[PDB]
Design a protein around this ligand. Sequence first.
Ligand SMILES: NC(=O)CC[C@H](NC(=O)N1CCc2c(cccc2-c2ccc(C(F)(F)F)cc2)C1)c1ccccc1
Length: 217
Amino acid sequence: QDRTIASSRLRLLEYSAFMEVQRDPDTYSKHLFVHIGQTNPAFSDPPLEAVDVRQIYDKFPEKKGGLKELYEKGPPNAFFLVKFWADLNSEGPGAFYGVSSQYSSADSMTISVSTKVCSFGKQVVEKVETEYARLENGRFVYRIHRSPMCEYMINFIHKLKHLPEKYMMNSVLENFTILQVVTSRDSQETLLVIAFVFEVSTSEHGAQHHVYKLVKD
Ligand SMILES: NC(=O)CC[C@H](NC(=O)N1CCc2c(cccc2-c2ccc(C(F)(F)F)cc2)C1)c1ccccc1
């Protein structure tokens, strides 16, 4: 069906992770490490490929809160895997590091958004954010705007760039994952689960991404 990152209850319209600096009072420069933009589905476009959830359980935390138990509760429709090719080709005291996200739903809800930064399948840090529905045409939208990045990730990015070669970065990135779970805050119902895996863009093509459905046949 749709290549969209969407369950039946919630769609990810946009995601970006960026650094922003002020060159001069009038001028700002903004660099996106990763970017998913709103795109509209195209009839021609092919169905999403599938990846077995069992193959990524190790990459992500386990036991409660883990990918296996979340998939068990469901819904299976809501689980997606996104691979990012990060643009590291961008040094300023006082640059801002932020993550911006947008979501859409048919029904107004108060959503809770958990973001877990993981190393070797284990959680370094978690963020829990509350967001509220805003009316738009034919839909309700939820905007996370300029959420500051955790200090771990800022340090991880600077030292990642210090590495002399991209294959080294890729070797690090193999055990770096992010797992995002969006729930209705009160019901705790799962609306959307995104597992993120990473590779450095080995070209100056810049930020690139690929979406997969997560299946448990
Ligand atoms: N709503 C949110 O997200 C939460 C805010 C913030 N969120 C964040 O810290 N991140 C971390 C960064 C991030 C994120 C999402 C997707 C991709 C990246 C990213 C990955 C790799 C690179 C690079 F390849 F360049 F290294 C750059 C960006 C998100 C956070 C998270 C956990 C604990 C406290 C605060």
